[PDB]
């Protein structure tokens, strides 16, 4: 029943939920693993922002990143770009997820800790600096996931589309010292990988960033 023990057991269950199941991937990633990676990416961008002179709320940076996909435990989320799911339909999914999280907290978390879990499990992406770090870090992981598959020779075009959408989103955050660094130093290393010159990525990247 209700207790932190149940919550601790649940952490392991996130190892058994995988990202965008269906299409073949040479390497699958659990939601737990994606969360570890997003928090590590966010941790890096936090350092970049502080180097640039920006005050970072570290508790907010880390909590947003670490907990952003915990709700995948009870409701799936669509990582591929808009094909069959509209905007109206994606908001319906968000409301269901919101309600289920509420019900989870009420059922499983002791009253003393419900307020902190309500805070930790709510929507983390907003226009705060830490919110925006979450927005870009989530897309950087999705970029790396899709790029990895392309680099390994995966033949499905969906991965090029995911890469394109992820990069286009990152580019909307180009005011950030984090994204400036990403575009200047990180992305060129990606595109310089052997064989990438033979793919669509260089051309897509130019189209999206100019």
Residues 6+ apart with CB under 8 A from 83: none
Q: 30 - beta bridge partners?
A: 18
Per CB under 8 A, 8 contacts its own copies: yes
Binding residues for Ca ion, rule: CB under 5 A, are: 51, 68-69, 138
Among 54, 157, 206, 209, binds its own copies (CB under 8 A): 157
CA distance 54 to 57: 10
Nearest residue (CB) to its own copies, 103 versus 209: 103
Four-point Cα dihedral 29, 31, 32, 35, nearest 10: 100
- Please tell me whether residue 36 binds its own copies under the rule CB under 8 A: yes
Cα–Cα dist 137/44, whole Å: 9
186/208 with CB nearer its own copies:
186
> Are the C-beta atoms of 137 and 182 separated by less than 8 Å?
no
The binder of 69, among Ca ion, its own copies, none, by C-beta within 5 to 8 A per type, is: Ca ion
Contact range with its own copies by CB under 8 A, out of 61-69, 125-133, 167-175, 201-209? 61-69
163 phi/psi in degrees, rounded to 5: -60, -45
Rounded to a whole number of angstroms, the minimum distance from the CB of residue 129 to its own copies is: 15
Q: How far apart, in whole angstroms, are the C-alpha atoms of residue 71 and residue 140?
A: 20
Show the binding pattern over residues 78-117: x = contacts its own copies (CB under 8 A), - = does not.
x----xxxx--x--xx-xx--xxx-xx--x--x-xx--x-
* 189 carries a ligand binding annotation: no
What's the CA gap between 41 and 140, in Å, rounded?
Answer: 8
Complex with its own copies: residue 132 or 149, whichever CB lies closer = 149
Closest CB 159 distance from its own copies, rounded Å: 11
């Amino acid at each position: 029943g209700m207790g932190i023990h149940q919550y601790f057991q649940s952490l392991s269950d996130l190892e058994n939920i995988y990202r965008c199941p269906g299409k073949f991937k040479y390497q699958e990633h659990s939601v737990a693993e994606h969360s570890y990676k997003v928090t590590s990416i966010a941790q890096f961008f936090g350092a970049v922002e502080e180097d640039a002179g920006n005050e970072v709320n570290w508790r907010a940076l880390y909590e947003k990143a670490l907990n952003h996909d915990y709700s995948e435990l009870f409701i799936g989320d669509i990582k591929t770009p808009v094909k069959y799911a509209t905007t109206e339909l994606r908001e319906m999914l968000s409301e269901v997820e919101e309600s289920m999280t509420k019900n989870f907290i009420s059922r499983e978390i002791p009253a003393t800790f419900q307020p902190i879990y309500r805070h930790l499990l709510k929507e983390g992406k907003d226009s705060t600096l830490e919110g925006k770090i979450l927005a870009i870090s989530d897309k950087v992981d999705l970029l790396y996931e899709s790029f990895g598959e392309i680099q390994k020779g995966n033949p499905e075009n969906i991965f090029v589309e995911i890469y394109s959408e992820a990069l286009a989103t990152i580019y909307e955050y180009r005011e950030m010292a984090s994204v400036k660094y990403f575009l200047k130093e990180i992305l060129p290393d990606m595109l310089a990988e052997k064989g990438i010159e033979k793919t669509e990525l260089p051309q897509l990247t130019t189209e999206i960033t100019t």
